[PDB]
C-alpha cells in the first residue's frame, strides 16, 4: 500500500550537530500584576544561520 508509512531503523547512529550560535538576551516585560513575559531583548555574537551538520 502507498498509504502507510515506512519506518526505517538504522544500525549506526548517524550523527547530527545542530546549533543556534547567538548570545540572545532575555528582556522581561511585566504584564502586571505579577505576570512577566520573556521577549528577545537582542542578539549578540556570530550571526550565523541556525543549522545542522551531518557527515556526508
Amino acid at each position: 500500500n502507498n498509504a502507510k508509512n515506512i519506518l526505517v531503523q538504522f544500525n549506526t547512529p548517524v550523527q547530527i550537530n545542530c546549533t543556534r550560535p547567538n548570545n540572545n538576551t532575555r528582556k522581561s516585560i511585566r504584564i502586571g500584576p505579577g505576570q512577566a513575559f520573556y521577549a528577545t531583548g537582542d542578539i549578540i555574537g556570530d550571526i550565523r544561520q541556525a543549522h545542522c551538520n551531518v557527515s556526508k
Epitope: I44, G45, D46
Partner: antibody, heavy 128, light 107 residues
C-alpha cells in the same frame, strides 16, 4: 569590569629574564584575549604577543619572535609574560590591551581586532 | 608591515585634513579594517575610528574613517588644537605579521 593593572618591569643589566603581569579584576579574566604592545620611548605601536582567554593559543610579534614566553595564571587569574633574554635593543616602555569587535561578528572571517584598554604600562631598562 | 602613513598632516586650524594610511593586498586589500588610534601629545593613544569608518563616543563626526579597496583614509574637519594630535593606524597582515602600523602623524 575593565580595571587593568600593568606591572613587572625591571632596572637591570642585559642578558636576563623578567616577569610581566597585567591584572584586571571584577570581570571575566578568562573572557577576553589580551595582547601586548610596547612603545620605544618616542616611537609608535609594537605588538608583542597575543594570548587566549585560556592561553590555549599564543602568537608573538616578529621583533621578539620566540624570545618572550607569554602565559597566564587562569584560576588565580593573572597574566605572566616571562620575557627572556632581555637586551638593550628593546629599550622601551610597555602597555597592555585587548580587542573587542566581538559584540556581533558578521562573517566567518573577522574584520580584525582592537586595542581598547590602556594603563600605566611598565618600566623596563635592561642595561648598565 | 608598515602602513603608508604620511609623516605629517597639515592644515590651518579649522581646515579639513585627510590622511591616507594605505597598505597592500595583504592588509587593506586583505579585507579587514583600519583601526586608527588617536594619541595626544604625551598621552597614551586610544581608539578614534574602529570598523574603519565608525565613530565611538566622544569623537566628533568631524572625525571619520573610511576604507576603499586597498586604501584606508581618515577625515577630520574643523581641525583645531584639541584636534592637532597624533594618529597611528593598525590592521591585519595576510602575509607575515599581525598588526601593521603606519608611521604616525600629527598636525
Amino acid at each position: 569590569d575593565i580595571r587593568i593593572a600593568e606591572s613587572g618591569g625591571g632596572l637591570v643589566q642585559p642578558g636576563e629574564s623578567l616577569r610581566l603581569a597585567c591584572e584586571i579584576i571584577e570581570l571575566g579574566f578568562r573572557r577576553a584575549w589580551t595582547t601586548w604592545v610596547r612603545q620605544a620611548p618616542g616611537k609608535g605601536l609594537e605588538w608583542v604577543a597575543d594570548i587566549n582567554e585560556d592561553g590555549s593559543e599564543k602568537k608573538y610579534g616578529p621583533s621578539v619572535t620566540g624570545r618572550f614566553t607569554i602565559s597566564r595564571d587562569n584560576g588565580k587569574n593573572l597574566v605572566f609574560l616571562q620575557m627572556n633574554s632581555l637586551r638593550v635593543e628593546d629599550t622601551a616602555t610597555y602597555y597592555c590591551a585587548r580587542e573587542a569587535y566581538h559584540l556581533v561578528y558578521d562573517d566567518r572571517i573577522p574584520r580584525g581586532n582592537w586595542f581598547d584598554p590602556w594603563g600605566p604600562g611598565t618600566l623596563v631598562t635592561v642595561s648598565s | 608591515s608598515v602602513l603608508t602613513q604620511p609623516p605629517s598632516v597639515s592644515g590651518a586650524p579649522g581646515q579639513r585634513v585627510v590622511i591616507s594610511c594605505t597598505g597592500s593586498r595583504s592588509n587593506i586589500g586583505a579585507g579587514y579594517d583600519v583601526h586608527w588610534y588617536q594619541q595626544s601629545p604625551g598621552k597614551v593613544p586610544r581608539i578614534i575610528i574602529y570598523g574603519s569608518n565608525s565613530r565611538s563616543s566622544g569623537v566628533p563626526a568631524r572625525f571619520s574613517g573610511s576604507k576603499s579597496g586597498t586604501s584606508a583614509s581618515l577625515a577630520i574637519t574643523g581641525l583645531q588644537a584639541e584636534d592637532e594630535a597624533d594618529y597611528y593606524c593598525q590592521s591585519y597582515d595576510t602575509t607575515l605579521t599581525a598588526s601593521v602600523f603606519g608611521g604616525g602623524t600629527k598636525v
